Amino acid sequence: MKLFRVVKRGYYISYAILDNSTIIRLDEDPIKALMRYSENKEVLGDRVTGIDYQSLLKSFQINDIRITKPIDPPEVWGSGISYENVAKILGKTIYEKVYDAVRPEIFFKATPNRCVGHGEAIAVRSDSEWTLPEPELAVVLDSNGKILGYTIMDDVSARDLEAENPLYLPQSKIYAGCCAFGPVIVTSDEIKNPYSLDITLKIVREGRVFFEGSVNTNKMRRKIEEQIQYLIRDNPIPDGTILTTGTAIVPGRDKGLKDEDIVEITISNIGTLITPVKKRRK
Amino acid sequence: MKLFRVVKRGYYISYAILDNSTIIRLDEDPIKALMRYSENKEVLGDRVTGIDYQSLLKSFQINDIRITKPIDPPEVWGSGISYENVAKILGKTIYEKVYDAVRPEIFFKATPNRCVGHGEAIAVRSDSEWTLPEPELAVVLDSNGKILGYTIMDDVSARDLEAENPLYLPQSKIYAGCCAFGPVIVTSDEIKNPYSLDITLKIVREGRVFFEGSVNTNKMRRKIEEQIQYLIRDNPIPDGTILTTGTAIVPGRDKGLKDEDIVEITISNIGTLITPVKKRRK
Amino acid sequence: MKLFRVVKRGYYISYAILDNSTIIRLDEDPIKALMRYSENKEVLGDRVTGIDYQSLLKSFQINDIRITKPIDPPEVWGSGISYENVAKILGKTIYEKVYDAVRPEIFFKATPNRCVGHGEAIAVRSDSEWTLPEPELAVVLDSNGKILGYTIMDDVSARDLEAENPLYLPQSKIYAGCCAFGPVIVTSDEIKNPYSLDITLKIVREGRVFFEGSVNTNKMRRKIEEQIQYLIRDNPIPDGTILTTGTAIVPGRDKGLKDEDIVEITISNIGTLITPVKKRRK
Amino acid sequence: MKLFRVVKRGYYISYAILDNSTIIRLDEDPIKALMRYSENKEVLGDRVTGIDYQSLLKSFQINDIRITKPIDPPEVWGSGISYENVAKILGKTIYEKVYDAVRPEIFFKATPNRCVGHGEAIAVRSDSEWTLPEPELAVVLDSNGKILGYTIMDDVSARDLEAENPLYLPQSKIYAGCCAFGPVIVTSDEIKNPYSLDITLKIVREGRVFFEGSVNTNKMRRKIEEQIQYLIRDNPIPDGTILTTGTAIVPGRDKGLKDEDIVEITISNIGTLITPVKKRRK
């Protein structure tokens, strides 16, 4: 099942697309639907026609419906340094340290209102001169840390603020439009192997491919199971929590996002998440 | 006005104590009440008798009412290094850097469910061997960053995890029972000068004063106004958000909290926040 | 316990006055409070001062609070001919028939929005030229037909429409402002004997006692228990349903209510219900 | 548009069938949907497949969905004597009087919880020995008395209690299962002429047509407009109120309903409402 959500005249409607391309209008809240599916693959709803999923992906809005975040994740957390000047501890950089350590990096990324969806704008802080998108596989979780599904997430990061001081990381990570995900959440059975997926990032500036890069999830060294373990340790998470699993695609120092850029992130078996960029004003 | 809240048979009742010791049962949600008071000092409710505020402070529960968090803060944020081995950038420690920099440290501390109140237990992570309480003046904020009142907050911190790597700060800060506040929120007019208040920390172990230390808020170098400025920059906060303003009372490396410790924090004009300690099990 | 309710800035607050004149602000919905009291005489709430009950009775509104219906009764039903030209069946009038029959008269009187309280206006239909108040003891009921308390009710009746044809009774009984009750609901233990209470009706026109009459409930022939029996037979009623028990005070044909009349109804141990009259315009 | 509603795992879903047999799952509450349609014929929702409307009509439940009341009418009112021993006024029967009078009969019939829908059981009072169904055209109304649509209603009537005394009419009319309607509500444009419709009643006893009778609405003498006029006079009604417009099909005194009877009522352009009968136990 691949779950998406539209906003229509101020209210939400959730839909699921099945492998045979049939679309079901959901009876339940999408997080509840994902929990149910995780249990027995049951889906409550009616088959609908006239919902053009492919058009929604490309054009964002058809008539009075517009695609958005597939769920409202009560919490969003991130991991980093999970794939194969700077602050340093006894001559060794903090990033190299975490890479070699038993304990992975886990940080709080966003509340639901700080997240945006497919076709909506991500933001660059007014006081950042070097913000990069971070293209990542993300998991939707229940309160036990069980994986309810997979999605694409952009961990939008003010890399300059982070480089300035690791103590500025929260400021570099948490703000309005700091986070984007979708366009769908795919159930766990839609991804046979999460560690064999292609991730492609494109930054499009005035029609021009200003940056393009790809990585396969077979390069992830710090596994998701371990990330979840450290996330939930002494730390309860609500159903529908999203954990984003780090990035291996890092544009250069001259590749900072600017106003009206288009960020496109593709992941195998999920789709392509597309977000315009808005630079915040001082 | 000094605002407190009790839980009674599973529901909440908010009360305000006035300077003349009269107690008012509030008609409105306490955050809404604080916003109203900030505007015109109006308080909606009835004067009650038989609510023994002083007893609630000392004994926590009287009959079927128990004092708790005075509000549910939708977000809790913290600042650090605000008062007059380690990771370092060009030989200078990250903490010294922030101290000397224009940009203060701002971090996400807690969601409301990770916070506890007067008489309830704070927690030490199962994987921390050195957790300290951090006694702080905290402010309750509206969405514009206007100060709606003051309270005592304990920023419970796994100092060992932080010392290990600054990238572990979120893990050291955010978990069940990582945060305590109260026992009251005092309106802004109850504190003539926020920069002239005594803060006293006591850690009581089996009746013994295991640690005691005090500092005056006249030692705060990074002002609250500036902390709020950087908190809300490109970053919307909900009404009732709490910002805790850093600490200057830091017990030694041998003063780590353990199970059944009692942490007591006193601030002038607010009161004394008292929380037992629970060590989490692996 | 004697229960009343005020409206304040668009919201409700319920209060109970105890025999010793102490006033309690209720934690629960008043119907729920009455059900609880019926079980074990427990009352959840705080003692309040500054609520001037006697003034509310006389002046209706003090400051920003105004007395109203003590509850929202989900259904209101009436009985008639319960105390010691016309349509007739085999020469015997329909009213004489019911009086002598095993089956009492039971009719639907009002929905909560068609009822008014102490100090609010009752109405005379635009097409009635002879409307009388009918002063009655009324009972508040749970879904099992158990008596939760007693109150005063005015069954406002377009007597001319009724006299015209018994088939017009619903029209004569059910309309906006057709029904008034209060000013309090008294718990069952406040009335030792429901069949030993004085009921007094006064219609005041421009300061003049235009009508006055009284009857004692010892003249009720059709008992309340029996009225309840026939009400609930094959007919579920919600908690807080009010059943009004008929009248023995019947003003003459020249005593029809008009605009700005004041109707006052006193019942022993309950109080005096006072309602101005508004004549509806065509 | 023809609107129906199903109950599914304890929740409701509303659907509309269009003239071309396409079925739309409604976004809005059905009363709200009817109000919108009355304004500009707009219908908010998605076209669904796999909802077998014809099967629902015949079999009542398909899989986990069951047809029910198409709306919850906040109030149900009735009119009688609207088509072309006893109590009498000056030798003339009360029924003949209303027939010849300017003022029609209007009575309160049911609350929503006393109503049932297609495929659900109507009831015969435990104390009635002669209960008849009364097959009627009914209208759904907004608060201004505007007709939002038409439906079939069964005004289930304890005719023996009524004959006993006109003052027993409420008891004969108002009780659990006293009222049935559906299976659909048709919008006003689905009925070109409400006064040219065939109404057919069948009472089926153990497979046998125990009674059959029909009448056309061209025999209605007291028009619906006039019934609505007297209903709403000084008497506010909520949106979705149902007014049932009287009957001309009256089975004989030996045709009283009994347990397990099937009552079927057909009206042109609406459909056939089918309800089993349950005799209530003493």
User: Which residue of C171, C233, C280, C282 to mutate against D (max D Cβ within 10 Å)?
Assistant: C171
Cβ within 8 Å, pair B50-C47? yes
| Most distant CA atoms of chain D, gap in Å | 63
Nearest to A165 among B98, B123, B161 (CB): B98
**B186 to chain C, closest Cα gap in Å:** 23
C chain contacts of residue B8, beta-carbon cutoff 8 Å: 27, 44
Say how far apart CA C185 and CA C1 lie, in whole Å: 8
User: Which residue of A75, A168, A222 to mutate against B (max B Cβ within 10 Å)?
Assistant: A168
**A49 to chain D, closest Cα gap in Å:** 6
Say how far apart CA D192 and CA B230 lie, in whole Å: 67
Say how far apart CA D9 and CA D65 lie, in whole Å: 8
Selection from C203, C172, C221 nearest residue C273 by Cα? C203
Coil, helix or strand at residue C44: coil
Sign for the pseudo-dihedral over CA of B213, B217, B220, B223: positive
A chain contacts of residue B176, beta-carbon cutoff 8 Å: 234-236
Strand A61-62 and strand A65-67: pairing? Answer: antiparallel
A chain contacts of residue B230, beta-carbon cutoff 8 Å: 171
Rg of chain A, C-alpha, whole Å: 18
User: Which residue of C114, C122, C165, C167 to mutate against D (max D Cβ within 10 Å)?
Assistant: C167
Selection from B97, B68, B57 nearest residue B80 by Cα? B97
- Taking CA–CA distances from B79, the nearest residue in chain A reads A167
Token duo for residue C7 = 């409206």
Coil, helix or strand at residue A150: strand
Nearest to D47 among A9, A13, A48 (CB): A48
The answer to whether B19 is a known ligand-binding residue is: no
Cβ within 8 Å, pair C166-D103? no
Chains touching chain A, criterion 3+ CB pairs below 8 Å:
B, D
Nearest to A234 among B123, B166, B234 (CB): B123
Selection from A203, A180, A177, A209 nearest residue A256 by Cα? A203
Provide the residue type at B104 as one letter: P
Say how far apart CA B129 and CA B211 lie, in whole Å: 17
- CB-CB neighbours of B212 under 10 Å: 13
Contact indicator for D212, D201 with CB cutoff of 8 Å? yes
Cβ within 8 Å, pair A51-D51? no
Token duo for residue B148 = 């709606």
Give whole-number Cα distances, C188 to C41, C139, C267, D75, in Å.
10, 9, 15, 32
The answer to whether C275 is a known ligand-binding residue is: no
Q: How was this structure determined?
A: X-ray
Contact indicator for A133, A248 with CB cutoff of 8 Å? no
**D273 to chain C, closest Cα gap in Å:** 23
User: Which residue of D25, D46, D47, D48 to mutate against A (max A Cβ within 10 Å)?
Assistant: D46
The answer to whether B255 is a known ligand-binding residue is: no
User: Which residue of B46, B48, B53, B64 to mutate against C (max C Cβ within 10 Å)?
Assistant: B46
Selection from B171, B162, B156, B153 nearest residue B69 by Cα? B153
Cβ within 8 Å, pair B166-A167? yes
Give whole-number Cα distances, B62 to B26, B45, B108, B277, in Å.
19, 22, 34, 22
Sign for the pseudo-dihedral over CA of D111, D115, D117, D120: positive
Cβ within 8 Å, pair C27-B13? yes
Say how far apart CA D115 and CA D122 lie, in whole Å: 8
Cβ within 8 Å, pair B233-A94? no
Say how far apart CA D129 and CA D254 lie, in whole Å: 10
- CB-CB neighbours of D91 under 10 Å: 7
Cβ within 8 Å, pair D105-C167? yes
Token duo for residue B125 = 């992570």
Nearest to D48 among A13, A44, A48 (CB): A48
Token duo for residue C276 = 């101005």
Question: Exposed (0-12), middle (13-18) or buried (19+): which is C30, by Cβ within 10 Å?
Answer: buried
Q: Which stretches within chain A are classed as H helix?
A: 30-40, 53-59, 94-100, 159-164, 169-173, 224-232
Nearest to A87 among B87, B127, B235 (CB): B87
Nearest to B94 among A106, A108, A165 (CB): A165
Residues of B with CB under 8 A from a CB of C: 8-9, 11, 13, 25, 27, 44, 46-51
**CATH fold of A1-70, please?**
Vcp-like ATPase; Chain A, domain 2 (3.10.330)
The torsion angles phi and psi of A230, rounded to 5 degrees, stand at -75, -30
Q: Thinking of the domain C71-282, which architecture would CATH place it in?
A: Alpha-Beta Complex (3.90)
* H or E element that contains B26: strand B23-26
The answer to whether A23 is a known ligand-binding residue is: no
Contact indicator for B158, B172 with CB cutoff of 8 Å? yes
Give whole-number Cα distances, D133 to B30, B222, D99, D177, D269, in Å.
56, 82, 21, 12, 21
Say how far apart CA D99 and CA C12 lie, in whole Å: 46
Cβ within 8 Å, pair C46-B44? no
The answer to whether B49 is a known ligand-binding residue is: no
Chains touching chain D, criterion 3+ CB pairs below 8 Å:
A, C
Token duo for residue C135 = 């002063």
Provide the residue type at A114 as one letter: R
Say how far apart CA D261 and CA D275 lie, in whole Å: 8
Locus of tokens 């692996």 = B282
Size of interface A-B (CB pairs under 8 A): 120
Q: Do chains A and C touch (3 or more CB pairs under 8 A)?
A: no
Cβ within 8 Å, pair D171-C230? yes
Sign for the pseudo-dihedral over CA of C22, C28, C33, C36: negative
Q: How do the domains of chain A map onto residue ranges?
A: 1-70, 71-282
Cβ within 8 Å, pair B47-C49? yes
**Residues in Cβ contact with D6 at an 8 Å cutoff, skipping those fewer than 6 apart:** D12, D13, D15, D56, D65, D66, D67, D68
Contact indicator for C174, C107 with CB cutoff of 8 Å? no
Cβ within 8 Å, pair A49-D51? no
Say how far apart CA D104 and CA D221 lie, in whole Å: 11
The answer to whether A75 is a known ligand-binding residue is: no
- Cα three-residue angle C15-C17-C22, rounded to 5 degrees: 110
Cβ within 8 Å, pair D108-C170? yes
Q: Which stretches within chain C are classed as H helix?
A: 30-40, 53-59, 94-100, 159-164, 169-173, 224-232
Chains touching chain B, criterion 3+ CB pairs below 8 Å:
A, C
D chain contacts of residue C107, beta-carbon cutoff 8 Å: 167, 170
Q: Which stretches within D13-141 are classed as H helix?
A: 30-40, 53-59, 94-100
User: Which residue of A23, A43, A46, A47 to mutate against D (max D Cβ within 10 Å)?
Assistant: A46
- CB-CB neighbours of A124 under 10 Å: 25
Cβ within 8 Å, pair A49-D47? yes
CA-CA-CA-CA dihedral for A160, A161, A166, A167, to nearest 10:
180
Q: Do chains D and A touch (3 or more CB pairs under 8 A)?
A: yes
Residue C29 exposure: Cα atoms within 13 Å on the Cβ side = 8
The torsion angles phi and psi of A137, rounded to 5 degrees, stand at -75, 135
D chain contacts of residue C105, beta-carbon cutoff 8 Å: 167-168
Q: Do chains C and B touch (3 or more CB pairs under 8 A)?
A: yes
Nearest to A46 among D27, D44, D48 (CB): D48
Cβ within 8 Å, pair B106-A230? no
Token duo for residue C82 = 């319960």
Number of H helices, E strands in chain C: 6, 22
Nearest to D175 among C127, C171, C234 (CB): C234
**Residues in Cβ contact with A241 at an 8 Å cutoff, skipping those fewer than 6 apart:** A73, A74, A75, A76, A77, A140, A141, A143
B chain contacts of residue C25, beta-carbon cutoff 8 Å: 25, 46, 48
A chain contacts of residue D25, beta-carbon cutoff 8 Å: 25, 46, 48
Spacing of C-alpha A246 from chain mean position: 10
Coil, helix or strand at residue B167: helix
